[model samples]
Target: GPLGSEAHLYMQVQIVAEDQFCGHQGNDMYDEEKVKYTVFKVLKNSSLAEFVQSLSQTMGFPQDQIRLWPMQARSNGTKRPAMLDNEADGNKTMIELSDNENPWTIFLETVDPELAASGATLPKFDKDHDVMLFLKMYDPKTRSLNYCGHIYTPISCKIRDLLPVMCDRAGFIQDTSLILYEEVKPNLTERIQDYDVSLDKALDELMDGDIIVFQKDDPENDNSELPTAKEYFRDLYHRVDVIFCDKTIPNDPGFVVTLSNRMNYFQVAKTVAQRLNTDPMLLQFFKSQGYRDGPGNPLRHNYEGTLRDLLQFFKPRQPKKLYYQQLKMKITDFENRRSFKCIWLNSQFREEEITLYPDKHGCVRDLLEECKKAVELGEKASGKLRLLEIVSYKIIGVHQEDELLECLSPATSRTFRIEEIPLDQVDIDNEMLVTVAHFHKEVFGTFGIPFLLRIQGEHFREVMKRIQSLLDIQEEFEKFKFAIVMMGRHQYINEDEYENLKDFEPQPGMSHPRPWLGLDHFN
Candidate 1:
């Protein structure tokens, strides 16, 4: 029940834009031509509530107050360069309620008395009000802005245009699973569809004049913002340029270095500008790089810059060789695992290959069988051991099975039993017996169950090598750019603990990449 003394009312106003810009991704519903909706919830109280109540009573409605306002639909946030080009999809219309004024305002004024009585008043002081204002766009059909419940008071009140309802059990499960499903597979179906083995092959088959499609999530695609799964790609790019580019033959030896946190055409242009000592906007840099060339000109090596060269500019006199060695060691250590097998898989190939097999290849299965047998033997031996230990008060490591069995007696039994009794009513001795049974079950259970799940991902280099071995050998690898996206529960761990075991010293040429626990990349 709401207090009657303080008059207040809650009303949600859905302000739809006739034309608005949605966003970029093709499947996104926002219309760039028309921004659809600007929804707001207004709280009326005191004098405002009286005005609304009088208006609502005069309008022939029986109710003295308004609770939920009718949603006003409009067209906005539509994509442009229009997907529906030449099709006359005119602006979405909002219904006219009041003759002259925006219908939304009139409705609010009509129901304000009851709204004020309900204590849905807007804040008088700025700091006290935590009111949020933002714009949102939606498609013409298949979407509705639902208003959830809100609380309003005379002195301090808050109102929401939309509120989420408690989900049914099935819906709760579905929503929870949706969140978990994303953890297992980060990008939805469309992103996965856009990728192919051809993209991976491009990292090795890149050549001059070849237009390679760089997927944002591919590791080989060195988008400056994310770099790659292995930082080596950046260094490799620079090395390729130094060895292949004719510009390396320095006429004017004064060199400049530029750093790009993002891997894009702009970043590449920036690198070129810094190296060539020219402005990026000017056509001279692109021309000097031989981008606009005919059949005979020098081949332009685009998308070639190394992490080594990039870092060298910062730390002069650092040898690239040391950097490479440190990087190789770090990679090996990070990928290393114990008591596990590794298998390499190819999407094109039907069969899986056991690349680097486990050390004790057949031991895992054998250990399981042995552990089962040991548990049975241990259970049989426990009776005799209990008798000897309780009676003699001396424990011995005995080997002869018959000799051990002889230690059990008729009266001083190997096993003891108690008549039916509740767990709480059980005697101390029976409780002890139950405790021993539980202890044995737990200790032996650990042996048969797998305590660790160790999976060794195939080496990126080895995978490339195998690809080359199966296909034609090539001189240049393809160019690609990707975003190495990651999502996980972030936590800080101290050194000398399982949490921080993944941390390591930075390689010679590379800066210390941020250390993380259970870090999974998005790409």
Candidate 2:
């Protein structure tokens, strides 16, 4: 019973990446109390070369390159014992070297330079020649994942080693970290997470004309399995919408980037300048619809801190858009003109910020005419364009024709905007232009055209009830948040604010009533 004589010597085997056993930083980050392994009954007296040979057959590697080590007393991969010598009874020698510790384990690895460089991956296949596997490439920007080309690939290799071969099938860069997918079901696909597995083992569900869909594998993009960080925070990257406010009829509404909430205002402005063709130093950044104070005002490096840091600070956080105003480093006032920002909103109440330069002595009517020349404001006279002085979010008043531009101040002109109304609908006393919009905290969708309502001396609750009637909502109307567009910011009007609209201070030096554009959201 030479072979069966040492049945008691059988033990569990755990062969892992050397770093994985040693718990190296940046490599074996997720160490376990008890590492995963297999149980193989073998003679303690068996030659180390023999065991290495079997591993060689399993992993398609040279037996000479394989190496083995035994754990120290009551230790994990952390303790490094002397490397086993290549000789007979090698397994028996390791068992004895370990001082006959209660049940021991052997750590086997490959010493091949190139193989070790691969992080010592033991992945799985069979053919020495190329086989058929259709391939497709992904274009993330255009959102196209069409089949690019097919290639002959060797199945006797793991998917890990086939990266270069896979990329070469199509026009792919060498560093293109790609994720390969296989159609495991009818018209269904499964991602090949096991990149080290042999292509033969991976292509078990191979069909005729079968293709592999490969996508750019971004680092730690998403967790398809298990739970840890994702359950708490997976796609929790901080995002900020940068609006290019050139103040034309229309500007870039916004372009967003995942800021990770760590970028400083200085760096953010730099990026903005690069994208929008402007200078960061000459650009002013603000996020708070329009706050004179720090929060939504100019974002200075010393005060405002990082983009994502504030992103984390915000609550009920719809992504706060960073509104930028391009400016001249120096402006000479020899022309005796003043540049003012106008919150120009369409019938939909999507506000756009455009700056207008008008003479300091220019009359309100003259400014209105200038607006027509600056930005194409309704070529056809639907009614006519008019200026509104939105002093505060709660107070809105129309500018009269006789007013002088120099008289306007932050006290009287916190928010100056323009709107178009028909000559027939000029009755601000009885009629109001309300944009009944569907708005999420972040997303925007139009409900319909502006609702013409003669909300004469109406209370906040009364107006809300009318909206409920329009939407046919049986639930309470309080679910919707109502706001007025002024100064490129949507000023929300609460029940108290709306009720006090009549009691508020009138427009400075103007007898004419104020105009209102209501933009509200259900979300």
Candidate 3:
């Protein structure tokens, strides 16, 4: 809104030249023309002739070659340019600027044929509706006509009232202060965006504040002037504070970073990575709804534009914070029993014995359900928890019947059975064992089968060099199962081998791993 009582309006300016005139000759004689649509402010009471003269001077064109007209909508609802008619009754026809009028379209007609052809079918002016302005400019040097820019005027205010406030000059440098806001995801907490701004101000007016002013002997230098009463405050700089919240664990403090309004998310991401001391290549910013515990996971909104656009859309609502968590893969072991007590051979997590159940199918949805129950029982929990994903692996091995039975619990008796024997005839050496292991993808996801074999040889030295290497191979295979959770083919392998193993036929008596989670695949 303009501050003064004089009406201020928005006008669109456009230019058209020889190249755009449709049926023109000798276009190669002229230089290439360039134009852009521009918006301008003008007083509602100013005459169209005055506006044209100002535009001609600014565009370096002769006033006589430029013609002004209005775009009008006919009764049939189509719009066309309305030409000024010269009558024979000694009456001169001119357009007068009035309140709430559409923008006047201007045309460039330097030659006789140009005006004659364009004016033949000119439409009659309709005084009741608003219209957009278009302009055309002709370059005599190249004999090329080019379409210039358009200017749009706001309908609510007169352009005259907005000129003073819109002008950027020494006395009109509004307020040099800006508000910085910070957001963290899920917690609904607010923080501040901080940055330092320095400006030149009179020493007598220097005061205590976040803004620091440099004092000099000639504070009034060459261009200092008193601000007009109509002048408004402006900011020297704009900034936003962002905090990324991690929702996976309770009471996790998220990452925090400050950004300027001038930066895009891509630039902000680089800054975020630097501040967090992480690889910029690994950090990605996603605009998402706070958090949810529902059927489909919360949608992650990705932003590729600028921070200013993001702030324009984000500030009016609740302040937002970001979240960061380790990428995890959930796995279920259907073959192992409750007392199996498998050890994580990689040493990423040590001293804890991992138990498995034959009837349990490892799925992220189920794990999240169990986590929700655990949180409910913990008493201090905020709400139900959700699982982001699950990664599973299957392993087949040979074991003694007694050892296999010992690992089985009553709950898994029906699922776990001796493959080649009557109940009373089973032997320790004749039994087969199957195991399933689950892990977070971030920790153990990159380990392929080849790496697992290497780790097995390094971790167990006694088994690695004995019995002519035969026992060592068998033992290594058994220990490798414990050392490496799943087959590497699931994550990274040749496209052919990967697909073949993924879709391998299940044995008559063994359980096969399920399809790869989501759309994840390797080529």
Candidate 4:
């Protein structure tokens, strides 16, 4: 609402900062030398015109019946005696007794030292300086006018802008939160129980925005123990577990499971049946007899088949490959089978019972240690991790030889090693890229399926150079469908595509351009 023109005007002034070189005390009514910026807001719009209009109807005064009487006194503190002075122009004068104009005026003149230091300058009447007007209304019960109405304009500068001129200039803003995620050991058999326990603790203690990471021990299958990288991911459930587990924070955050196995839809169906501990005949029974509507069957056979069909949509005609043997050799050591002890349940009999695997209390300490390592790594490598998604997939199909070894170390049991090549000391002409290229060739040669070697941005260029130097494989830069954005950075993928891939339409007012008009205060 506009501050009523009929109302009295009140102005407040302050200075933000002063030039140390220039000795000046900033004041609005004084010199304009020191003030940098000033903000204004309409405080009140109470006017006698409004008060009189409201009173006329209730008090039986006809419209324009009441008049204003003016009183004038000398500035020397002496009251001017009333006199019958008259003029031909007929403007009401202090001499009149019945004119009824009783005007009250006040003048403020105080210099604030704080405002002198602050760089206070006159504010423009634009969107950055929009004002709000409030009204005080008379209330009979309390014998005082209560604050009744207010008006606001859309444009206004924030008060923080004045901080630059203030002697004690401190700005107010929100504090940011940081989180980290790190990878644990890939050989679950060695630290399976521990992994479960640590994960549970993370879910309990961590906040929603906290970062989490699965430290990569190898180029592929860092969390899988299968001899080959592709085989490790074939079970699918392991991928589901690692990726989905972190998202468990917000409880049932959506998830997608990516698979790299050679199985087609029908083959995958059989595997799913095996994992679920359901008879293969049951699958065939659904296929031949079709779905039954009766209440006896708890499972949705047709829906399961539909999912299998949907899986076929994603299968590529030319399957990618990865190296399995080399990945297995990368394992430095493995916990012996004799050392493994299963608890919490008898041998697993159904898919639903798999959640019980982590219930055993034996490996809680080891799991806690793994959790600590993951959290610590996440913190140290946070900047790099921000360049990648929280969870991603790499398909290491069955063609590579060392894919398995690189993914899981057979000797030390570490998924992969963070081997640092000291670039500062190495010769400029060194064959680091050539060596990496050869490593890539060896790894890709063994696996017959496609695989993605996900890595942090810090290592991304080095790894890319190594792969290109060693192998003659053509590089194709393909962008992914989705990305995660944070801290004003496009962390995971190309932003152009991601922006175009919105799931919803733009909001009404947001779809159009908006301008800042100096008249915003008129609203």
CA error at residue 517 for candidate 3, angstroms: 35
Find the 10 residues in a row with the least total lDDT in model 3. 226-235
TM-score of each: 0.15, 0.24, 0.21, 0.12
Q: What does the lDDT come to for candidate 2?
A: 0.53
In angstroms, how far off is 353's CA in candidate 1? Answer: 72
Candidates by lDDT, descending order: 2, 3, 1, 4
lDDT of 2 by residue, 1-523 (tens): 7667666765434555444433211111113445665444444555455566766677566665555555432222223323345554455443454455535555555554676666564321122344545455544433334444334456656888867866875577889888777633222345787888877788773422345666666644453331222111222223345334433224445566444455787777778778767667666665554233123544444545776564453443344555556666522232346677777755444567888777777888877776777555455646477776543332345668898877766463367777776445564554444323344443234343333333445677777776666556676555566665433345577755566242222336554343344545543
| Backbone clashes (count) for model 1 | 62
Model 4: lowest-lDDT 10 consecutive positions = 514-523
| Candidate maximizing lDDT | 2
Question: What lDDT, from 0 to 1, does candidate 1 have?
Answer: 0.25
Candidate with better lDDT, 1 vs 3: 3
Model 4, span 352-375: residue lDDT tens: 111111112323333222223332
Give each prediction's root-mean-square deviation over alpha carbons. 36.6, 23.2, 25.2, 38.5
For residues 48-78, write the lDDT of model 3, one tens digit per residue: 5656667768766565544544333344332
- Candidate 3 global CA lDDT score: 0.33
* Residue-by-residue lDDT tens digits, candidate 1, 230-326: 2222332233122112232333333333433334434544555555455444311111222222112221224354333333333223221111001
